[PDB]
Ligand binder design. Structure first.
Ligand SMILES: [Zn+2]
Ligand SMILES: [Zn+2]
Lengths: 153, 150
């Protein structure tokens, strides 16, 4: 399902060695760059699941010229306010609103400001992907910290 | 739960006789004004359920000076594009985005343009309510057509 949201196929995932791979090429057992919010350290972790879905509703989040495209309900870490945030959080989920001028955390641990957010509907449904990542349950999508799908959700 | 969304306690519901009652005063068996999209006719229908929740995340949808305050995932009928819409539709739900300059359907069948939408977080959780309405599964909240929890 799409309860944790999903990224478009050409979203780049930061591998453990800081190489970049498209999410649609990710496989179970792939080692990705991940982050433990308490230690404030970067750790490698295996992908334990990768699933392909479809949807026609997406949001583009700009941070400078760089951007990420995902379902409106994907969660991103704001390292300024130290909160997990989404453009469209479910009420009672405990996830905060993600808005223009909020911050994302880069794969090098820097605060990147969000300069623009837009929602749009594609003519046809496009392929989207969600992954599970052991231990830290997060990864870097186009260089910013995003939350991985969880079973406990 | 809050999958269908909910309205704040001081949301006015149009009764069958076109009187207004606060959603927090609504009772099972109350007859409310409702709408069948196919017939394009107004019908009376009984509330079958009313539940009180809490949340601190809300959006305000303005249509002129009037507005409605609900969870971001509440569905409203746009009579211009003839689609059910939400500020924050769940992906794959088949609900379209509701945005500034879209349209709402008044309790008298008139298209009212949305002039502003904003999301905010309250200091403390507030009480919010969803209802079930037989047959048409909709009602008028501050005079605009809204979907009832299916
Ligand atoms: Zn899934
Ligand atoms: Zn409920």
């Amino acid at each position: 399902n799409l309860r944790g949201g999903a990224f478009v196929s050409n979203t780049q995932i930061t591998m453990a060695d800081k190489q970049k791979k498209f999410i649609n090429e990710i496989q179970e057992g792939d080692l990705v760059r991940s982050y433990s919010i308490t230690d404030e350290t970067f750790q490698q972790n295996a992908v334990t699941s990768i699933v392909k879905h479809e949807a026609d509703q997406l949001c583009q989040i700009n941070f400078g010229k760089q951007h990420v495209v995902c379902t409106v309900n994907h969660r991103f870490y704001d390292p300024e306010s130290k909160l997990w945030k989404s453009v469209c959080p479910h009420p009672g989920s405990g996830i905060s609103f993600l808005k223009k001028y909020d911050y994302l955390l880069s794969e090098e641990g820097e605060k990147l400001q969000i300069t623009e957010i837009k929602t749009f509907t594609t003519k046809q449904p496009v392929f989207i992907y969600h992954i599970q990542v052991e231990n830290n349950h997060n990864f870097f999508a186009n260089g910013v910290l995003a939350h991985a799908m969880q079973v406990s959700i």
